Protein backbone atom coordinates (compact mmCIF):
# COMPACT_ATOMS: atom_id res chain seq x y z
CA UNK A 1 0.00 0.00 0.00
CA UNK A 2 1.59 3.39 -0.94
CA UNK A 3 2.35 6.00 1.83
CA UNK A 4 1.93 3.57 4.89
CA UNK A 5 5.57 4.28 5.95
CA UNK A 6 4.88 8.07 6.27
CA UNK A 7 4.30 9.60 9.73
CA UNK A 8 3.35 13.21 10.41
CA UNK A 9 4.84 14.71 13.60
CA UNK A 10 1.82 16.63 14.92
CA UNK A 11 2.91 17.82 18.45
CA UNK A 12 5.72 17.83 21.03
CA UNK A 13 4.81 15.54 23.96
CA UNK A 14 7.98 16.32 25.97
CA UNK A 15 11.55 17.77 25.78
CA UNK A 16 14.65 16.94 27.86
CA UNK A 17 18.24 15.71 28.01
CA UNK A 18 17.74 13.23 25.24
CA UNK A 19 15.99 15.46 22.83
CA UNK A 20 12.28 15.42 22.29
CA UNK A 21 9.35 13.04 22.18
CA UNK A 22 6.85 13.82 19.40
CA UNK A 23 3.34 12.54 18.73
CA UNK A 24 3.51 10.82 15.28
CA UNK A 25 0.38 10.01 13.23
CA UNK A 26 0.44 7.57 10.28
CA UNK A 27 -0.56 9.24 6.95
CA UNK A 28 -2.72 6.26 5.86
CA UNK A 29 -3.95 4.38 8.99
CA UNK A 30 -3.95 7.35 11.49
CA UNK A 31 -2.20 5.07 14.07
CA UNK A 32 -0.64 7.23 16.84
CA UNK A 33 2.86 6.46 18.15
CA UNK A 34 5.43 8.40 20.22
CA UNK A 35 8.71 9.15 18.42
CA UNK A 36 11.77 9.69 20.63
CA UNK A 37 14.32 11.83 18.71
CA UNK A 38 17.90 11.40 20.08
CA UNK A 39 20.73 13.49 18.46
CA UNK A 40 24.12 11.67 18.95
CA UNK A 41 23.72 5.23 25.45
CA UNK A 42 20.92 5.00 22.83
CA UNK A 43 22.53 1.72 21.59
CA UNK A 44 21.81 0.00 24.98
CA UNK A 45 18.27 1.61 25.21
CA UNK A 46 17.36 0.18 21.72
CA UNK A 47 18.98 -3.21 22.61
CA UNK A 48 17.02 -3.41 25.90
CA UNK A 49 13.80 -2.21 24.15
CA UNK A 50 14.14 -5.06 21.54
CA UNK A 51 13.89 -7.61 24.44
CA UNK A 52 10.62 -6.12 25.85
CA UNK A 53 7.01 -7.30 25.40
CA UNK A 54 4.57 -6.85 28.30
CA UNK A 55 1.19 -5.05 28.76
CA UNK A 56 2.73 -2.84 31.57
CA UNK A 57 5.91 -1.93 29.60
CA UNK A 58 5.93 0.80 26.88
CA UNK A 59 5.89 -1.00 23.45
CA UNK A 60 8.86 -0.72 21.11
CA UNK A 61 7.89 -0.69 17.41
CA UNK A 62 11.35 -0.10 15.90
CA UNK A 63 14.13 2.40 15.30
CA UNK A 64 15.41 4.46 12.32
CA UNK A 65 18.83 6.18 12.09
CA UNK A 66 19.10 9.36 9.93
CA UNK A 67 22.77 10.39 10.09
CA UNK A 68 23.61 11.01 13.77
CA UNK A 69 19.90 11.17 14.84
CA UNK A 70 18.10 8.06 16.20
CA UNK A 71 14.29 7.76 15.94
CA UNK A 72 12.73 5.49 18.58
CA UNK A 73 9.16 4.42 17.66
CA UNK A 74 7.45 3.87 21.02
CA UNK A 75 3.94 3.42 22.40
CA UNK A 76 1.75 6.55 22.59
CA UNK A 77 0.15 6.70 26.04
CA UNK A 78 -2.57 9.41 25.77
CA UNK A 79 -3.09 9.54 29.59
CA UNK A 80 0.40 11.06 29.95
CA UNK A 81 2.48 10.60 33.12
CA UNK A 82 1.28 9.12 36.44
CA UNK A 83 3.06 12.18 37.93
CA UNK A 84 0.16 14.48 36.77
CA UNK A 85 -2.48 12.19 38.40
CA UNK A 86 -0.90 12.86 41.81
CA UNK A 87 -2.49 15.92 43.45
CA UNK A 88 0.22 17.88 45.39
CA UNK A 89 0.17 17.23 49.17
CA UNK A 90 -3.02 15.02 48.70
CA UNK A 91 -2.17 12.10 46.36
CA UNK A 92 -5.08 10.21 44.76
CA UNK A 93 -7.93 7.86 45.92
CA UNK A 94 -6.47 4.74 47.62
CA UNK A 95 -8.27 2.29 45.16
CA UNK A 96 -6.67 4.14 42.16
CA UNK A 97 -3.21 3.92 43.83
CA UNK A 98 -3.69 0.17 44.57
CA UNK A 99 -4.66 -0.58 40.91
CA UNK A 100 -1.61 1.45 39.65
CA UNK A 101 0.66 -0.33 42.18
CA UNK A 102 -0.66 -3.78 41.02
CA UNK A 103 0.16 -2.85 37.38
CA UNK A 104 3.56 -1.45 38.43
CA UNK A 105 4.39 -4.81 40.16
CA UNK A 106 3.33 -6.81 37.04
CA UNK A 107 5.70 -4.67 34.87
CA UNK A 108 8.64 -4.91 37.37
CA UNK A 109 8.11 -8.75 37.84
CA UNK A 110 8.31 -9.06 34.02
CA UNK A 111 11.52 -6.96 33.74
CA UNK A 112 13.22 -8.74 36.69
CA UNK A 113 12.13 -12.12 35.25
CA UNK A 114 14.12 -11.41 32.03
CA UNK A 115 17.12 -10.03 34.03
CA UNK A 116 16.41 -6.30 33.36
CA UNK A 117 16.54 -3.51 36.02
CA UNK A 118 14.88 -0.16 35.02
CA UNK A 119 17.00 1.76 37.68
CA UNK A 120 14.85 4.98 37.45
CA UNK A 121 11.31 4.09 38.55
CA UNK A 122 9.41 7.32 39.34
CA UNK A 123 5.90 8.70 38.37
CA UNK A 124 7.46 10.66 35.42
CA UNK A 125 8.49 7.23 33.93
CA UNK A 126 5.09 5.57 34.45
CA UNK A 127 2.72 6.37 31.57
CA UNK A 128 -1.03 5.82 31.22
CA UNK A 129 -2.88 4.71 28.06
CA UNK A 130 -6.50 5.85 27.15
CA UNK A 131 -7.86 3.19 29.61
CA UNK A 132 -5.53 4.38 32.51
CA UNK A 133 -3.31 1.25 32.13
CA UNK A 134 0.17 1.85 33.55
CA UNK A 135 3.24 1.33 31.32
CA UNK A 136 6.89 1.44 32.49
CA UNK A 137 8.72 3.97 30.29
CA UNK A 138 12.27 5.02 29.27
CA UNK A 139 14.96 2.33 29.35
CA UNK A 140 17.84 4.83 28.94
CA UNK A 141 19.22 3.95 32.43
CA UNK A 142 18.26 0.23 32.32
CA UNK A 143 20.80 -2.63 32.40
CA UNK A 144 21.05 -6.46 32.40
CA UNK A 145 21.67 -7.73 35.97
CA UNK A 146 21.23 -11.48 35.20
CA UNK A 147 22.81 -13.28 32.22
CA UNK A 148 23.19 -17.07 31.69
CA UNK A 149 21.38 -17.42 35.09
CA UNK A 150 24.32 -15.59 36.73
CA UNK A 151 23.54 -12.46 38.78
CA UNK A 152 25.81 -9.45 38.28
CA UNK A 153 26.08 -7.04 41.25
CA UNK A 154 25.77 -3.36 40.37
CA UNK A 155 28.03 -0.43 41.37
CA UNK A 156 26.91 2.37 39.00
CA UNK A 157 25.27 5.36 40.71
CA UNK A 158 22.06 6.22 38.87
CA UNK A 159 18.39 7.03 39.20
CA UNK A 160 16.79 10.10 40.88
CA UNK A 161 17.84 10.91 44.50
CA UNK A 162 14.33 10.98 46.24
CA UNK A 163 13.64 7.49 44.69
CA UNK A 164 17.08 5.84 45.17
CA UNK A 165 17.63 3.02 47.69
CA UNK A 166 20.01 3.84 50.64
CA UNK A 167 22.51 1.02 49.69
CA UNK A 168 23.23 2.92 46.39
CA UNK A 169 24.53 5.80 48.56
CA UNK A 170 26.27 3.73 51.29
CA UNK A 171 27.69 0.65 49.54
CA UNK A 172 30.20 0.02 46.73
CA UNK A 173 28.10 -2.93 45.36
CA UNK A 174 24.43 -3.85 45.69
CA UNK A 175 21.78 -6.25 44.30
CA UNK A 176 19.67 -4.77 41.43
CA UNK A 177 16.17 -6.09 42.42
CA UNK A 178 15.83 -4.52 45.97
CA UNK A 179 16.72 -1.08 44.41
CA UNK A 180 13.68 -1.20 42.01
CA UNK A 181 11.49 -2.49 44.94
CA UNK A 182 12.51 0.62 47.03
CA UNK A 183 11.70 3.12 44.18
CA UNK A 184 8.25 1.37 43.79
CA UNK A 185 7.71 2.06 47.54
CA UNK A 186 8.53 5.79 47.03
CA UNK A 187 6.08 5.82 44.04
CA UNK A 188 3.39 4.23 46.35
CA UNK A 189 4.18 6.92 49.04
CA UNK A 190 3.74 9.75 46.42
CA UNK A 191 0.43 8.27 45.12
CA UNK A 192 -1.02 8.11 48.70
CA UNK A 193 0.29 11.42 50.15
CA UNK A 194 1.10 13.66 47.14
CA UNK A 195 4.60 14.31 48.52
CA UNK A 196 8.07 12.72 48.61
CA UNK A 197 9.26 11.69 52.12
CA UNK A 198 12.92 12.85 51.77
CA UNK A 199 15.43 14.49 49.37
CA UNK A 200 17.61 11.32 49.63
CA UNK A 201 17.77 8.26 51.99
CA UNK A 202 20.87 9.23 54.01
CA UNK A 203 21.56 9.61 57.82
CA UNK A 204 22.22 13.38 57.20
CA UNK A 205 18.56 13.70 55.95
CA UNK A 206 16.28 14.48 59.00
CA UNK A 207 13.07 13.09 57.35
CA UNK A 208 14.87 9.79 56.61
CA UNK A 209 16.09 9.61 60.27
CA UNK A 210 12.49 10.22 61.54
CA UNK A 211 11.18 7.30 59.36
CA UNK A 212 13.91 4.97 60.77
CA UNK A 213 12.80 6.15 64.28
CA UNK A 214 9.18 5.20 63.21
CA UNK A 215 7.79 8.78 63.64
CA UNK A 216 4.74 7.97 61.45
CA UNK A 217 2.73 10.78 63.22
CA UNK A 218 4.61 13.19 60.86
CA UNK A 219 3.97 13.90 57.13
CA UNK A 220 3.70 12.08 54.68
CA UNK A 221 2.96 8.91 56.78
CA UNK A 222 0.11 10.47 58.81
CA UNK A 223 -1.92 10.88 55.53
CA UNK A 224 -1.58 7.14 54.73
CA UNK A 225 -3.99 4.50 56.08
CA UNK A 226 -2.38 1.88 58.38
CA UNK A 227 -2.84 -1.06 55.88
CA UNK A 228 -0.80 0.48 52.91
CA UNK A 229 1.52 2.07 55.58
CA UNK A 230 2.32 -1.46 56.98
CA UNK A 231 3.33 -2.43 53.38
CA UNK A 232 5.52 0.73 53.12
CA UNK A 233 7.14 -0.34 56.46
CA UNK A 234 8.22 -3.59 54.71
CA UNK A 235 9.42 -1.90 51.44
CA UNK A 236 11.29 1.09 52.88
CA UNK A 237 13.71 -1.08 54.98
CA UNK A 238 17.35 0.23 55.02
CA UNK A 239 18.92 -3.26 54.80
CA UNK A 240 18.27 -4.51 51.21
CA UNK A 241 18.76 -8.17 52.40
CA UNK A 242 15.88 -7.71 54.92
CA UNK A 243 13.70 -5.64 52.50
CA UNK A 244 10.49 -7.36 51.25
CA UNK A 245 10.71 -9.10 47.81
CA UNK A 246 8.03 -8.80 45.09
CA UNK A 247 6.69 -12.42 45.74
CA UNK A 248 6.03 -11.31 49.38
CA UNK A 249 4.58 -7.89 48.31
CA UNK A 250 1.92 -9.97 46.41
CA UNK A 251 1.07 -11.69 49.77
CA UNK A 252 0.65 -8.33 51.63
CA UNK A 253 -2.79 -7.70 53.21
CA UNK A 254 -3.34 -4.23 51.64
CA UNK A 255 -2.03 -5.46 48.24
CA UNK A 256 -4.86 -8.08 48.32
CA UNK A 257 -7.52 -5.77 49.91
CA UNK A 258 -10.70 -5.46 47.77
CA UNK A 259 -11.05 -1.69 47.21
CA UNK A 260 -11.83 -0.87 43.57
CA UNK A 261 -14.72 -1.60 41.27
CA UNK A 262 -13.92 -2.56 37.68
CA UNK A 263 -14.38 0.11 34.97
CA UNK A 264 -18.07 1.06 34.84
CA UNK A 265 -19.52 -0.70 31.82
CA UNK A 266 -22.68 0.79 30.19
CA UNK A 267 -25.95 -0.38 31.75
CA UNK A 268 -29.71 0.33 31.45
CA UNK A 269 -32.75 -0.37 33.75
CA UNK A 270 -36.30 -1.96 33.35
N1 LIG B 1 11.42 6.86 26.60
C2 LIG B 1 10.31 7.02 26.40
C3 LIG B 1 8.93 7.22 26.14
C4 LIG B 1 8.34 8.51 26.29
N5 LIG B 1 7.06 8.72 25.97
C6 LIG B 1 6.36 7.68 25.46
N7 LIG B 1 5.02 7.87 25.10
C8 LIG B 1 4.14 8.91 25.27
O9 LIG B 1 3.01 8.88 24.79
N10 LIG B 1 4.61 9.95 26.05
C11 LIG B 1 3.87 11.09 26.52
C12 LIG B 1 2.49 11.21 26.29
C13 LIG B 1 1.83 12.34 26.71
BR14 LIG B 1 -0.03 12.50 26.37
C15 LIG B 1 2.48 13.37 27.35
C16 LIG B 1 3.83 13.26 27.59
C17 LIG B 1 4.54 12.13 27.20
N18 LIG B 1 5.90 12.02 27.60
C19 LIG B 1 6.87 12.83 26.86
C20 LIG B 1 8.32 12.46 27.13
C21 LIG B 1 8.57 12.21 28.61
C22 LIG B 1 7.70 11.08 29.12
O23 LIG B 1 7.85 10.92 30.53
C24 LIG B 1 6.23 11.25 28.80
C25 LIG B 1 6.96 6.41 25.31
N26 LIG B 1 8.22 6.18 25.66
Centre of ligand 1 from the C-alpha of residue 151, in Å: 31
Ligand 1 atom nearest to 15, measured from its CA: 20
**Ligand 1 atom 12 nearest Cα:** 80
Please work out whether the CB of residue 118 comes within 6 Å of at least one atom of ligand 1.
no
Q: What is the resolution of this structure in A?
A: 2.2
Report the residue among 12, 25, 34 best suited for mutation to probe ligand 1: largest number of ligand atoms under 8 A from its CB. Answer: 34
Q: Which helix (H) or strand (E) holds 39?
A: strand 32-39
CA-to-CA separations, 240 to 19, 167, 171, 244, in angstroms, rounded? 35, 7, 11, 8
Q: In terms of Cα–Cα distance, which of 152, 9, 28 is closest to 69?
A: 9
230-252 core/surface letters (b: 16 or more CB in 10 A; e: else): ebbbbbbbbebeebbebeebeeb
CA-to-CA separations, 113 to 105, 109, 110, 188, in angstroms, rounded? 12, 6, 5, 22
Beta partners for residue 21, in sequence order: 14, 36
**Are residues 81 and 2 part of one domain?**
yes
120 as an active site residue: the answer is: yes
DSSP 170-231: H-S-B-HHHHHHHHHHHHHHHHHHSS-S-SSSSTT-HHHHHHHTT-TTSTTGGGS-HHHHHH
Report the residue among 13, 18, 61, 133 best suited for mutation to probe ligand 1: largest number of ligand atoms under 8 A from its CB. Answer: 13
CATH number at residue 264: 1.10.510.10
CA distance 157 to 30: 41
CA distance 208 to 12: 38
Q: Which helix (H) or strand (E) holds 116?
A: strand 116-117
Residue 138 CB: number of other CB atoms within 10 A? Answer: 22
Centre of ligand 1 from the C-alpha of residue 168, in Å: 27
**Are residues 179 and 75 part of one domain?**
no
17 belongs to an annotated ligand binding site:
yes
**Are residues 156 and 118 part of one domain?**
yes
Centre of ligand 1 from the C-alpha of residue 116, in Å: 21
Ligand 1 atom nearest to 79, measured from its CA: 14
The whole domain housing 57 covers 1-87
Experimental method for this entry? Answer: X-ray
**Are residues 123 and 36 part of one domain?**
no
CA distance 220 to 243: 20
Please work out whether the CB of residue 80 comes within 6 Å of at least one atom of ligand 1.
yes
**Are residues 158 and 70 part of one domain?**
no
**Are residues 172 and 98 part of one domain?**
yes
**Are residues 141 and 28 part of one domain?**
no
Is residue 7 a contact partner of residue 24, using CB atoms and an 8 Å limit? yes
**Are residues 126 and 192 part of one domain?**
yes
192 belongs to an annotated ligand binding site:
no
CATH number at residue 12: 3.30.200.20
**Are residues 63 and 121 part of one domain?**
no
CA distance 171 to 5: 49
Please work out whether the CB of residue 21 comes within 6 Å of at least one atom of ligand 1.
yes
**Are residues 143 and 196 part of one domain?**
yes
What does R_g of the chain's alpha carbons equal in angstroms?
A: 20
Q: Which of 87, 121, 149 is the endpoint of a domain?
A: 87
CA distance 108 to 164: 16
Determine what percent of the chain falls in helix, strand and coil, rounding each to the nearest 5.
30, 20, 45
CA-to-CA separations, 231 to 43, 182, 235, in angstroms, rounded? 37, 12, 6
Q: Which of 87, 113, 143 is the endpoint of a domain?
A: 87
**Are residues 192 and 177 part of one domain?**
yes
Ligand 1 atom nearest to 124, measured from its CA: 23
CA distance 5 to 62: 12
3-state secondary structure of 161: helix
Q: In terms of Cα–Cα distance, which of 32, 30, 31, 34 is closest to 137?
A: 34
Residue 6 CB: number of other CB atoms within 10 A? Answer: 11
Q: Which helix (H) or strand (E) holds 110?
A: helix 94-113
Q: Which of 43, 64, 87 is the endpoint of a domain?
A: 87
**Are residues 173 and 203 part of one domain?**
yes
Residue 45 CB: number of other CB atoms within 10 A? Answer: 21
CA distance 102 to 104: 5
Centre of ligand 1 from the C-alpha of residue 5, in Å: 22
| Active-site choice (39, 120, 138, 252) | 120
Q: Which helix (H) or strand (E) holds 266?
A: none
91 belongs to an annotated ligand binding site:
no
When divided into structural domains, the chain yields a total of 2
Amino acid sequence: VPFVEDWDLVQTLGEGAYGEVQLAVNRVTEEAVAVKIVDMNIKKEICINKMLNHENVVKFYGHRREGNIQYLFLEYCSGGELFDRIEPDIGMPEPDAQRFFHQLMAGVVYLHGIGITHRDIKPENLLLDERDNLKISDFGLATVFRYNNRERLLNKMCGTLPYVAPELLKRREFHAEPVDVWSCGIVLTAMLAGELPWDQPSDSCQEYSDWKEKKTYLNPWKKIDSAPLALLHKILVENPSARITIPDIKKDRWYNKPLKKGAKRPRVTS
